[PDB]
Paper text:
Glucuronyl esterases (GEs)4 are enzymes able to cleave ester linkages connecting lignin to glucuronoxylan in the plant cell wall. GEs belong to the α/β-hydrolase superfamily and possess a catalytic triad common with serine-type hydrolases. OtCE15A is an interesting member of CE15 and the α/β-hydrolase superfamily in that it features acidic residues at both the canonical and noncanonical positions (Glu-290 and Asp-356). Here, we have investigated by mutagenesis the residues involved in catalysis and carbohydrate binding in the enzyme OtCE15A and, furthermore, present a series of structures of OtCE15A with different ligands, including monosaccharides and, for the first time in CE15, di- and oligosaccharides.
We also pursued a complex structure of a catalytic histidine mutant (H408A) with BnzGlcA. We determined the structure of the H408A variant in the absence of substrate and saw only minimal changes in the protein structure. Substitution of either the catalytic serine (Ser-267) or histidine (His-408) with alanine significantly compromised the OtCE15A turnover rate (kcat), reducing the rate by 17,000- and 1,700-fold, respectively. As for the S267A variant, despite several attempts, we were unable to trap the Michaelis complex with BnzGlcA in the H408A variant.
Residue numbers in the entry: 35 to 431
């Protein structure tokens, strides 16, 4: 049984956009922070420094300008940093125009999103499952290893820049990774035990996405008011939490984000709260473990995280065979979030059951399910590019 997003914590009905934006949204953001992801301890830190390390105006055979940027989270050269890779379509900037952007984290390093041999190899810890890794270190053989999730050339040909950062720059995806992370520097309390409401990897990954947006605001080649933040699976959990917390993001795409992302936790289908916390104890707050095999006690569910994107366009998508993510749970979260989008005059999927494969449904709140297993395919990206065409042609007032 789901909590109503349009009934406030004190029982009062939310009938208007101002009550939603200025009372209900903060209420919900604090519940997710305390009980699920942990508290984001600060937004933009003082002293952000942006250093363009490489700049090639004829990348991808002339189709793109490629930028690599060190985004340091403080002015001292000893503060932590992340490495941002950016491809911008030369066709747009040759017209004296700023390109809209797709921004998303990657799983195995910037050098894996494209075979482009001029990308810096990540100098960070790489997980064991990464293709062609030599003892947790990037290798030349890993180049383009994950390019099937990154149709860079097609995205650029449709008029969008592509920005990415390796999630492991922010928090290595391993159970001890928070100790080697922004979190270890940022909320570096004198103590050692992680506090019960301290953020984990998803919170730290999300914060990195907002810091990448800070960089895009300074880059004259891109329009930072037209940024679609996207992610696949665990990095899609991060894209949703980033897009919910930071309403600068123009559009939000959740590709098969599953448990603790778009899927309802109270459905108890596929991956559950207990299973995700037991396998990935660093992803959520320790407080989220209160709900292991007790999802009935959750004071929110993930439809309210989706509602936190409203009125900005939100795309939630599933893969038919990806039962672990609970595709029907992701769809029903979209349906339970729709009344908030409707409050703002937007439309969600028509229907009470999962649509047929490869038949997207909904207006600014959109869903599709595609055939096959978990992944981020050319078919997913085709639907996202049409979505962005419709809801990200926003360079006019
Ligand atoms: Mg800009
Ligand atoms: Mg589930």
């Amino acid at each position: 049984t789901l909590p109503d997003p349009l009934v406030g914590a004190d029982g009062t009905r939310v009938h208007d956009r101002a009550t939603w934006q200025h009372r209900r949204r903060p209420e919900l953001l604090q519940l997710f922070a305390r009980e699920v992801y942990g508290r984001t301890p600060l937004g933009r830190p003082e002293g952000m420094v942006f250093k363009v390390t490489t700049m090639e105006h004829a990348a991808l055979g002339g189709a793109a300008t490629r930028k690599e940027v060190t985004v340091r989270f403080g002015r001292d050269p000893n503060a932590p940093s992340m490495q941002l890779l950016l491809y911008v379509p030369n066709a747009v900037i040759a017209r004296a125009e700023r390109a809209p952007v797709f921004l998303g984290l990657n799983f195995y390093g910037n050098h894996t999103v494209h075979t482009d041999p001029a990308i810096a190899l990540s100098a960070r810890w790489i997980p064991a499952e990464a293709p062609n890794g030599a003892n947790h270190r990037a290798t030349e053989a890993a180049r383009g290893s994950d390019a099937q999730k990154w149709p860079v050339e097609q995205i650029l040909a449709r008029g969008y820049a592509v920005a990415t950062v390796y999630c492991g720059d922010l928090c290595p995806d391993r159970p001890d990774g928070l100790n080697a992370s922004v979190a270890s520097w940022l909320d570096a309390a004198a103590g050692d035990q992680r506090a019960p409401d301290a953020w984990g990897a998803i919170g730290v990954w999300a914060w990195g996405l907002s810091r990448a947006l800070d960089y895009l605001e300074t880059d004259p080649l891109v329009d930072a008011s037209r940024v679609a933040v996207h992610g696949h699976s665990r990095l899609g959990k991060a894209a949703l939490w980033a897009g919910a917390q930071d309403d600068r993001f123009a559009l939000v795409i959740s590709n098969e984000s599953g448990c603790g992302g778009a899927a309802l936790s109270k459905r108890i289908h596929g991956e559950t709260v207990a299973r995700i916390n037991t396998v990935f104890p660093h992803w959520f707050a320790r407080n989220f473990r209160r709900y292991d095999d007790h999802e009935e006690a959750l004071p929110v569910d993930q439809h309210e995280l989706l509602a936190l994107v409203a009125p900005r366009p939100l795309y939630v998508a599933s893969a038919e065979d990806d039962d672990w993510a609970d595709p029907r749970g992701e769809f029903l979260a979209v349906k339970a979030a729709e009344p908030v989008f409707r409050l703002f005059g937007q439309t969600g999927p028509s229907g009470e059951d999962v649509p047929r494969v490869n038949e997207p449904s909904g207006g600014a709140l959109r869903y599709h399910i595609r055939p096959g297993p978990a992944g981020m395919t050319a078919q997913d990206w085709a639907f996202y590019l049409a979505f962005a065409d419709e809801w990200l042609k926003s360079a006019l007032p």
